[PDB]
Structure formats: C-alpha cells, structure tokens
Amino acid sequence: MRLCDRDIEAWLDEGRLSINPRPPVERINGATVDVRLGNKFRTFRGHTAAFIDLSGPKDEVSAALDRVMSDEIVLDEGEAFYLHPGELALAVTLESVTLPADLVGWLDGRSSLARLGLMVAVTAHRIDPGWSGCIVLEFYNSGKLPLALRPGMLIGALSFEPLSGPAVRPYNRR
Amino acid sequence: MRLCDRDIEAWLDEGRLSINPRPPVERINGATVDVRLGNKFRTFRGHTAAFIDLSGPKDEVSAALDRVMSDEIVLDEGEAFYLHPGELALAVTLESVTLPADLVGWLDGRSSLARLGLMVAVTAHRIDPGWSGCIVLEFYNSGKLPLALRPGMLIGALSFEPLSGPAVRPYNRR
Amino acid sequence: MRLCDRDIEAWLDEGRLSINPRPPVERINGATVDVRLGNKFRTFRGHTAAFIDLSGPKDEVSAALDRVMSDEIVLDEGEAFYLHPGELALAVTLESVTLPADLVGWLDGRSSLARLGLMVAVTAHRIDPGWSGCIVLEFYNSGKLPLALRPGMLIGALSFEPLSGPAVRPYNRR
Numbered sequence: 001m002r003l004c005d006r007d008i009e010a011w012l013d014e015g016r017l018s019i020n021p022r023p024p025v026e027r028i029n030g031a032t033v034d035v036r037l038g039n040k041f042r043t044f045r046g047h048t049a050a051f052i053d054l055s056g057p058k059d060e061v062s063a064a065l066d067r068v069m070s071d072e073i074v075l076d077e078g079e080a081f082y083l084h085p086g087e088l089a090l091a092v093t094l095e096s097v098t099l100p101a102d103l104v105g106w107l108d109g110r111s112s113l114a115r116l117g118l119m120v121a122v123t124a125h126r127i128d129p130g131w132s133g134c135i136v137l138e139f140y141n142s143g144k145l146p147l148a149l150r151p152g153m154l155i156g157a158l159s160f161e162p163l164s165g166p167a168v169r170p171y172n173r174r
Numbered sequence: 175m176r177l178c179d180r181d182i183e184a185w186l187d188e189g190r191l192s193i194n195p196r197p198p199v200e201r202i203n204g205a206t207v208d209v210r211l212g213n214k215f216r217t218f219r220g221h222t223a224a225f226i227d228l229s230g231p232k233d234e235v236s237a238a239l240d241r242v243m244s245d246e247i248v249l250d251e252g253e254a255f256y257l258h259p260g261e262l263a264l265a266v267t268l269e270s271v272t273l274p275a276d277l278v279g280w281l282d283g284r285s286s287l288a289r290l291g292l293m294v295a296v297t298a299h300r301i302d303p304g305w306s307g308c309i310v311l312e313f314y315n316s317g318k319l320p321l322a323l324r325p326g327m328l329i330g331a332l333s334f335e336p337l338s339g340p341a342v343r344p345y346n347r348r
Numbered sequence: 349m350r351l352c353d354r355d356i357e358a359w360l361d362e363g364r365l366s367i368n369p370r371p372p373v374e375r376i377n378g379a380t381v382d383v384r385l386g387n388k389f390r391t392f393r394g395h396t397a398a399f400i401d402l403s404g405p406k407d408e409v410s411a412a413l414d415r416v417m418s419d420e421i422v423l424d425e426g427e428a429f430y431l432h433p434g435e436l437a438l439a440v441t442l443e444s445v446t447l448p449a450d451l452v453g454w455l456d457g458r459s460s461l462a463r464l465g466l467m468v469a470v471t472a473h474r475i476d477p478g479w480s481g482c483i484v485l486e487f488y489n490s491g492k493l494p495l496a497l498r499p500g501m502l503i504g505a506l507s508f509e510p511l512s513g514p515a516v517r518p519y520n521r522r
C-alpha cells in the first residue's frame with residue numbers, strides 16, 4: 001500500500017523515513033517524492049577485459065565493476081554528461097535516503113524522459129528496508145540521439161510501501 | 175496491496191475507478207486488467223537535432239519531444255506498425271483510465287511479448303492518483319527481428335494499489 | 349503491502365506460499381527471497397523468419413516463439429552461458445514458485461548485475477495469484493561486454509504482496 005504525499009510528509013516529520021536533503025512540498029506529490037541527479041558518473045571502458053563473470057560473490061562482481069568501469073567523473077557547474085545511444089552509464093541520486101525496517105522503496109524513472117530513450121532501473125527499482133545512502137543509478141540510452149543529463153535535474157520518483165511488519169534482517173543488519 | 179479482479183470490478187462499478195471503454199470480465203483477472211494497443215504512433219527522426227537536453231522544464235522536454243519525433247501515425251484497419259530492432263517508438267493505450275486520489279496504477283507489459291523483445295515501460299510504469307487519460311507507451315525492440323504491432327492487441331496489464339490515504343496533491347490538482 | 353522476511357517465512361511454513369526448493373534463511377531478507385539461475389537457455393535464430401507478428405492468440409505468439417528461438421540449451425557442471433552485448437536470451441529460475449489466489453509476486457533483477465548491463469524483466473515482473481511453476485526469464489545485455497551467467501547464481505529477488513481479497517480468477521483457474 002503506497003504512502004500518499006501527505007503520509008510521506010508524516011513519516012519524514014517523525015524521523016522514520018529520512019531523505020537528505022529533504023525535498024520540499026513541490027517535490028512530494030500523489031504517491032512519490034521526486035529525486036534528483038547527483039554528480040558522480042561512470043562509463044564502460046571494456047578493452048582491458050574479454051567478459052565479465054556475473055556468478056561469484058559481491059567482491060568479484062564489485063572487483064569486475066571497477067576493472068571495466070571508468071574513474072569517477074565529477075561535472076562542474078554548467079556541465080552536462082552526454083549519454084550516447086546504446087551506452088550504459090552509472091550515476092547516483094543527489095538525495096541520500098534512509099528507510100526503516102518496515103518500509104520498502106521503489107524508484108521509478110520519469111516517463112517523459114523514458115519517451116526520449118532514457119532507461120533507468122528498469123531491472124532493480126527496489127530500495128530495501130534498512131537501506132541508507134545514495135541510490136546508484138544505471139542509465140541506458142535506448143533512443144536514437146544522445147541525451148544530455150545535468151546534475152540537479154529531476155531523474156526519478158520514489159514511492160514507499162509499508163511492509164506487513166518490521167523486517168527481521170533489513171539491509172543495515174546483515 | 176493490490177486489488178484482486180473482483181475488487182477492481184467493485185471500484186469500476188462504484189465509479190471510483192474509471193476505464194473507457196470498460197473491459198469485460200475476460201480482461202479482468204487475478205490482480206490485473208488487460209489493456210489494449212491504441213492507434214497513435216510516433217518514431218524518431220533525429221537528423222534535425224544533435225542531441226536532446228533532458229534537464230530543463232516540461233515545456234523544453236516536450237518541445238524537444240516534437241522537434242525530433244515524427245508526426246502522429248494513424249494505422250488503418252488491417253495495418254501493422256513494425257517496430258524494428260533497436261528502435262524506440264511511442265504509442266498509446268486504447269483505453270482511457272481515470273484514477274482517484276487514493277489509488278495508484280502500475281502498467282506491466284506482457285511477458286510473452288517481452289520474450290520476443292518487446293520492452294514496455296520499463297522505466298516509468300506508474301499511473302498516478304488523479305491520472306485521467308490514455309497511457310502513453312514507449313516501446314523498445316530489444317530483440318533480433320522486427321515486431322509487428324496491430325491496434326487492438328493486448329499490450330499490457332494494469333494493476334491497482336490503494337494508497338495509505340487520499341493524496342493531497344494528486345495529478346489532476348497541481 | 350509487501351511481506352517482510354519473517355512473514356514470507358510464515359506463509360512458507362503454513363503452505364500458503366510455496367517455493368521449491370525452499371530457500372534457507374540466508375536467501376530470505378528484508379522483503380525479498382533471492383532466486384537462482386536455472387539451466388534451460390534459449391537464443392534467437394532469426395534467419396528463418398522476416399518478422400514476428402505479436403497480435404494474434406497465445407498459440408500464434410507461442411508458435412512464433414519456437415519458430416525463431418533455438419533449441420533448449422542445457423549447460424553442464426562448470427559451463428557458463430555468455431550473453432553478448434545487444435542479445436536477448438531466455439532462461440528460467442532454478443526455483444519453482446506457487447502463489448495462492450490472494451498473493452501477487454514481483455521479480456526484481458539484481459541491481460549489482462544491472463550495473464554491468466544485465467537487464468531482467470524489466471517489462472513484466474509480475475507473478476500472478478495462482479501462478480505455479482518456474483519463472484521464465486528474458487535477459488538483455490545492455491552493456492559493452494559479454495556477461496557470463498552460470499546455473500545456480502543469484503539472478504533475482506521475489507517480493508510478495510497480499511491482495512485486497514482472494515482473486516476470483518487466479519492464474520490456475522481460467
């Protein structure tokens with residue numbers, strides 16, 4: 001059952017849901033909180049590696065993630081990151097988000113951007129009970145033209161769903 | 175908490191959820207209402223523009239949407255729209271949908287079509303409290319062959335989730 | 349309203365949700381049950397067909413699915429399936445899943461894999477009330493390198509949502 005805008009505001013006020021920085025009324029509507037584009041980007045540089053083995057522990061999958069992804073790319077004031085057709089890029093939300101053990105988050109991308117080819121998780125839109133941090137984003141340009149993204153733009157929408165009870169093993173405790 | 179088929183039928187009957195035209199019992203099952211393909215299509219013609227700037231207000235993002243997308247394409251009786259591999263196309267549901275301030279919709283594409291490469295929102299599957307209208311669809315052909323789509327085919331599935339309370343700023347009031 | 353880990357464990361214990369084989373505590377966390385990669389794969393071989401017509405009954409859409417998809421591919425011990433950039437492949441979960449008429453499932457892919465290009469449903473992540481069986485998976489490699497998948501790896505995450513009441517026409521009864 002999704003929280004409506006007014007109840008998102010309630011859970012924020014009680015300190016049971018945290019979002020930093022806290023988005024104003026303008027960005028809390030219906031059943032979502034708008035989220036923004038951060039300033040840390042990553043792209044592929046595949047030439048060092050033949051493939052990526054996706055089986056095997058987090059450490060292998062994370063070691064791989066860094067052997068083939070570029071250095072962090074931080075954009076100045078003004079600057080846009082251009083995501084070219086058929087490219088997969090990694091980014092991050094501006095907002096940090098902390099969920100309690102009895103809420104689950106869902107990130108939607110924006111539909112108006114999807115229509116121009118911007119694909120955002122997509123595969124895993126779930127923010128877990130106990131998640132605390134920025135949300136890592138994967139973009140895919142499914143469109144015909146390059147898409148310019150600037151830090152601070154609206155990039156997605158969080159909605160929040162109470163669980164049937166507080167989770168015994170939330171993200172933070174494992 | 176999703177409405178089951180019987181309760182979708184209830185909310186339709188009370189006039190608290192509206193779907194036009196109203197789908198018969200055949201198309202209301204489990205926790206979804208089947209939706210159909212409309213008859214308004216759009217494709218990319220990128221050659222006029224170098225890129226699309228996705229930051230900046232709706233009007234810019236919508237101005238862009240029309241500078242680079244084709245004219246509306248309306249298909250006769252018989253006719254199919256062929257969505258070619260790697261193409262992003264825009265379409266619309268046959269059904270209009272109106273949600274009240276205390277329901278949120280989710281559009282799924284059909285799994286049997288996804289298996290042949292048909293990707294449908296995907297990024298933003300959320301229909302908001304207060305949404306009233308057709309649902310704009312983005313298709314992406316992730317497969318190897320062209321996919322023929324005909325107006326009237328089943329194209330997706332709506333499910334409906336009550337909010338924790340009626341939303342203070344639903345879509346219609348902003 | 350999603351079941352938390354403890355309540356997923358409850359519904360499993362009561363025999364109201366079934367997952368075979370039953371995943372241990374390690375794979376039931378927050379609001380999800382981890383699911384694994386099975387051992388039945390399929391790829392496209394498009395050269396026999398010009399297109400696929402996606403309108404027309406299940407039997408046509410399923411006839412098509414077999415005229416253009418390869419034979420079942422079963423991988424030995426050791427073996428990896430390599431999903432190459434821009435390829436759409438079909439697979440299956442290791443676990444069989446049975447839902448009752450008053451629960452709906454959602455499959456997420458894993459975010460750490462999505463970041464390396466692994467796209468999993470994506471378009472239809474919904475497991476219906478009354479669904480009983482393996483879950484068919486479509487993968488898409490949106491990344492730059494090939495991705496190696498091995499049977500038994502974690503491939504996704506199931507979450508479960510009670511309906512507003514038991515569904516009158518669940519999947520099994522139609």
Ligand SMILES: Nc1ccn([C@H]2C[C@H](O)[C@@H](COP(=O)(O)OP(=O)(O)O)O2)c(=O)n1
Pocket residue numbers: 108109110111112113157281295298299300301302303305308309310311312345
């Ligand atoms: N695939 C979709 C998804 C949403 N919509 C509709 C339904 C929603 O109430 C609105 C807003 O969706 P969303 O917030 O993701 O779009 P914006 O880019 O913020 O305008 O558009 C649609 O027409 N087609």
Ligand SMILES: Nc1ccn([C@H]2C[C@H](O)[C@@H](COP(=O)(O)OP(=O)(O)O)O2)c(=O)n1
Pocket residue numbers: 282283284285286287331455469472473474475476477479482483484485486519
């Ligand atoms: N990725 C998926 C999604 C759904 N399924 C299963 C689970 C659901 O109960 C059914 C129906 O899903 P869906 O309505 O989207 O598929 P259809 O094209 O209408 O047959 O198939 C699956 O095997 N793999």
Ligand SMILES: Nc1ccn([C@H]2C[C@H](O)[C@@H](COP(=O)(O)OP(=O)(O)O)O2)c(=O)n1
Pocket residue numbers: 107121124125126127128129131134135136137138171456457458459460461505
């Ligand atoms: N697009 C996303 C999705 C999830 N996350 C966060 C939120 C979740 O609590 C975690 C776990 O997501 P998930 O189980 O799909 O990822 P793993 O591959 O299992 O580590 O990561 C994210 O940063 N970006």
Ligand SMILES: [Mg+2]
Pocket residue numbers: 110157
């Ligand atoms: Mg919005």
Ligand SMILES: [Mg+2]
Pocket residue numbers: 107120121122123124125126296
């Ligand atoms: Mg998602």
Ligand SMILES: [Mg+2]
Pocket residue numbers: 284331
């Ligand atoms: Mg269906």
Ligand SMILES: [Mg+2]
Pocket residue numbers: 281294295296297298299300470
């Ligand atoms: Mg979606």
Ligand SMILES: [Mg+2]
Pocket residue numbers: 458505
């Ligand atoms: Mg996980």
Ligand SMILES: [Mg+2]
Pocket residue numbers: 122455468469470471472473474
């Ligand atoms: Mg999905």
